[PDB]
Write a protein that binds this DNA or RNA. Structure first.
Length: 42
RNA sequence: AAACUGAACCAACGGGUCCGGAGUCUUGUUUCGAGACAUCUGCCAGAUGGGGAGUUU
């Protein structure tokens, strides 16, 4: 009687609370960080 | 897929404490629209201008 059972969250657009995602790209960085990147882009 | 008020968190689990579950990558913007334009910025130039100033009559 082993009741260990997988119960996957199955994240979908409307379904379950997702796991935390890495927001690094869309994050708001401090003023000097976005600035020392953009200066490279130029 | 006309609609007519339910619930969802703090991982279950799988693989060899890590990696999955939850694709990886970055010549780099937070994303979208416009864009070398103008309602952008500064100076120079004209027109208008009793809205306002001075004075005369």
């Amino acid at each position: 009687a082993s009741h260990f059972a997988a119960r996957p969250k199955n994240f979908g657009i409307g379904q379950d609370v997702p796991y935390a995602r890495d927001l690094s790209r869309f994050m708001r960085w401090p003023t000097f960080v976005t600035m020392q990147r953009k200066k490279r882009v130029l």
